[PDB]
Every structure is written in C-alpha cells, then in structure tokens.
C-alpha cells in the first residue's frame, strides 16, 4: 500500500470540508462546525503555501503513484483512479515572540479511522517538521483536548511536549460583537 | 489628565517591542526562553501587510492631547520608551497578534501572542483598550474568533479576560515541538 503527501488545490475543497467535519465528529463538537465548501474555497488559497493557511493531503493507493473503508467513494479525487484521500494536516505561520521568528501552528492533523495506526499520521507530522526546518521555523505548536490520550501519546512519541499549565482563551463572534459596541 | 493612543508599529519601534517582549518573559518567569534580538524582530515583523501576518499595536501615553486619570505615574523606565527623546510620548504597552484559521469556521481569525501593559500603567483601562482594538479590528475584517493562551497561575489576566467576555478553558493543552525536536524528526 503506497502513500503520498501533496499540497491541496481548490478542487480538493470537498475532501477538506469532509475531513474537518470528521475532526468535529471525533472531538464531539459538530455543533461548532459551521464551515461550508464556499468558505473554504474563499479562504484557503489566497496566499502561497507556507505564507498562510496551508494544507497537506495524504493519499493512499494499492498501486504506485504515477483495510475496510466505508467512505471510500466520498474521497476519490478521480473516480477512475484507485487513489483515496486518507487524511490531512492544516497549518499556518504563527509567531513565538520569545524567538522573534515565525513558527507554525497546526490547527488540524487527522487520519480517517480506517487508515489509523499505520504510520501515516507520523508521515503527516514529519512532513510539517521537515518543512519547518527547511524554512528556518523555530517552533511548531498546536493544542490537544485533555481526554484525547491517543493523540497525546502520539505527539509525545514524536517528541512533543504537552503542557498542563496553559489554558486556551477565546472570544467568539458574539463576544466580539459585544466588545465592538465599546 | 493623561491621553492615550493605539497605533501600528513601524521598524523604528523595534527597540520598544523587544523590551516589552522581554518584560513579558520576566513576568512569566520564562527569561531562559527569551532569545529574541532586535535584529530578529526587525527582520521578521515587517515582511507583510498589517493584519495579513504578524501585527503589533503600541499603546502610547502623553500628558498632552495626542497630535492624532489625574493620578501621577512613577515610571522608572520612561527614558527607554520614548519614540522621540524631545517629545512627551511614552510606549506603555503592546499587543502582538497574527491571522489564525479556526478550521470549524473555515475563515481566518486572530491569535494574540502577547498583550502587555508595563507595570506603572496597569489598572487604568489601557489593557482593555488594547484588547478592544484587536476586537474591533476583528469585527471590521469579518474575523469569526480570537484566541490566545494564558498561564494557569495568572489569575489577574484570567479575570481581565473573563470580564472582557473571553472563555477561558480547562480542557485544552498546549503542545510544542522545539527546534531540537524538529531537528530530530528531520533526520527520519
Ligand atoms: C492522532 C492521529 C493523527 C495519529 O495518526 P495515526 O496514523 O493513527 O498514528 P501512527 O500510526 O502514525 O502512529 C505512530 C507510530 O506510533 C505507534 N503508536 C503507539 N502508540 C500510539 C498511539 N497511542 N497513537 C498512535 N500511534 C501510536 C503506531 O503504531 C505507529 O508505529 P507504526 O508506524 O509501526 O504503526 C490519528 O490517529 C487520530 O487519532 N486522528 C483523530 C484526530 C485527533 O485525535 N486529533 C487531535 C485533536 S484534539
Ligand atoms: C493583563 C493586563 C494586560 C491587563 O492590563 P490592565 O491595563 O491592567 O487592565 P485594565 O486596567 O484594562 O483592567 C484590569 C482590571 O483591574 C480593574 N481596574 C482597572 N482599571 C480600573 C479602574 N480605573 N478603576 C477600577 N478598577 C479598575 C478591573 O477589575 C479591570 O477589569 P476591567 O478593565 O474589565 O474593568 C496587564 O495586567 C498586564 O500587562 N499583565 C501581564 C500579564 C499578561 O498579559 N500575561 C499574558 C500571558 S500568560
Ligand atoms: N502567552 C504566550 C507567551 C508565552 C511564551 N512566549 C512562551 O514561549 O511560552
Ligand atoms: N485542535 C484544533 C481543533 C479544535 C476545534 N476546531 C475547536 O474549535 O474547538
């Protein structure tokens, strides 16, 4: 079984939408998932890779590039080819101010359930890491939910530090409107 | 009285930004992690347009109305924070932020890396002003969410954030690959 990581293009938007949806299902947060394909197509491709939101897709094939998967049909970039989008990583430049240099923040990293535990998640993170080194990025950060001990273990095995002392803060759209009237 | 202004940072503001980030590191007891130089800031802060990448707002204070409360302020570092040595204007604080991407919204938001008022200018409403400025900018640009992180012992900031209507979560954990971790993965 062969694998490839490639950059997302505008025609990949349906797959990206569905992957983010599956992330929301995994996190039990579907009520927060308001993304549309329209919104993704509007926001994902306004800059060059690495300068803003960037997406890598992991594709799988039983043949070289030129497991029960129930959703296979939803994830074929081309119906005539046995190539299936198995997972993705979505990230963008951040700014660790103590380093006075850009880093990367990983918003999502996700393998569809049938392709878990096969080394593909490692491949995705490796690809972000190697790109970070090449581009002189000094740090990669993301967040994980506390019950998600599977991801935490994965991250820790890949050499990530997972802290207990930092708390996420958020202003929602509604909170922002409220402040805006000041 | 004392008058206040928020403005975008320019390359000549790098010394002040450096010193403010340094004071942030002191506050957080993380000076061992503070390796930023003025050189690095000058080479990384101004490669893009405002709001489209790392962006800094400075809060300046002047005893005179600004060429766009009575309580006197003892500021020992005033001389380190004058954009013009002949001018009665002092950099009192900053917010440093950049576009993020809440994927569930499929639209850019903002993440705040630092928000900081120098100790002599705390508890006077200026922190509110900084956050308000980021928030208003977010609304104008159609941003759906603003996020940042706070350290668990920092009950002052937590309270401030909560009073500004922020949600402060218990369930999310910060994860990090250091430079060293990245080199190790690179050799796979
Ligand atoms: C987290 C995730 C991206 C990891 O991808 P993955 O493909 O399952 O992980 P890998 O198979 O690359 O695991 C890395 C290696 O460590 C091993 N390993 C040991 N314990 C592991 C664990 N708890 N999780 C994953 N791998 C583990 C794997 O077997 C693998 O070795 P291998 O190459 O010989 O198979 C994915 O599995 C997943 O769970 N996605 C759900 C979304 C999620 O949890 N997101 C976090 C947001 S809160
Ligand atoms: C957190 C911080 C940015 C807030 O700045 P600040 O200017 O002190 O905050 P404000 O003056 O706007 O408000 C602080 C609170 O003190 C009280 N206060 C402030 N000014 C007041 C006044 N004039 N009268 C009465 N109470 C007042 C209020 O409870 C106020 O909350 P409010 O603004 O909703 O009324 C500032 O304390 C700081 O720089 N600390 C460093 C810590 C940090 O930022 N860490 C983040 C990473 S862990
Ligand atoms: N609130 C974010 C600042 C934390 C510090 N820059 C760090 O690198 O841990
Ligand atoms: N790990 C990042 C995913 C978190 C999710 N999009 C949220 O908004 O809660």
From Swiss-Prot, chain A:
Q: Name one GO molecular function term.
A: N-acetyltransferase activity
What Enzyme Commission number(s) apply to this enzyme?
Answer: 2.3.1.-
Give the induction annotation.
By methyl jasmonate, and wounding by the aphid M.persicae, and the lepidopteran herbivores P.rapae (white cabbage butterfly) and P.xylostella (diamondback moth).
Q: Which GO terms describe its biological process?
A: defense response; ornithine metabolic process; response to jasmonic acid
Top-level taxon of the source organism: Eukaryota
Please report a single Pfam family linked to this protein. Acetyltransf_1
Q: Which PROSITE patterns match?
A: GNAT
Enzyme class, spelled out: transferase
* Gene disruption phenotype: No visible phenotype under normal growth conditions, but mutant plants are unable to produce N5-acetylornithine in response to methyl jasmonate.
Residues of the signal peptide: none
Location of the N-acetyltransferase domain: 55-182
Ordered alphabetically, the record's keywords are: Acyltransferase, Plant defense, Transferase
Residues engaged in binding acetyl-CoA: 109-111, 117-122, 148-151, 155
Q: Which InterPro entries match?
A: Acyl_CoA_acyltransferase, Diverse_Substrate_AcTransf, GNAT_dom
Summarizing the function annotation, the protein's role is: Acetyltransferase that converts ornithine to N5-acetylornithine, which is likely used in plant defense.
Family statement drawn from the similarity comment of this UniProt entry: Belongs to the acetyltransferase family.
Q: Which PANTHER family match?
A: DIAMINE N-ACETYLTRANSFERASE, GH14572P-RELATED
Supply the name of the protein.
Answer: L-ornithine N5-acetyltransferase NATA1
Q: Which organism is it from?
A: Arabidopsis thaliana
């Amino acid at each position: 079984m062969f694998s490839r990581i490639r950059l997302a293009t505008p025609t990949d938007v349906p797959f990206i939408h569905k992957l983010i949806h599956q992330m929301a299902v995994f996190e039990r947060l579907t009520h927060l998932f308001v993304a549309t394909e329209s919104g993704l197509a509007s926001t994902l491709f306004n800059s060059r890779p690495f300068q803003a939101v960037t997406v890598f897709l992991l594709e799988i094939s039983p043949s070289p590039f030129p497991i029960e998967d129930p959703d296979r049909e939803k994830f074929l970039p081309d119906k005539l080819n046995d190539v299936v989008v198995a997972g993705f990583v979505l990230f963008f430049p951040n700014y660790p101010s103590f380093l006075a240099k850009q880093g990367f923040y990983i918003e999502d990293i996700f393998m569809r359930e049938p392709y878990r535990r096969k080394g593909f998640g490692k491949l995705l993170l490796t690809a972000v890491a190697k790109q970070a080194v090449k581009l002189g990025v000094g740090r990669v950060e993301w967040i994980v939910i506390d019950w998600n001990v599977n991801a935490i273990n994965f991250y820790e095995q890949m050499g990530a530090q997972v802290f207990k002392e930092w708390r996420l803060c958020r202003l929602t759209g509604d909170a922002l409107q409220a402040i805006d009237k000041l």
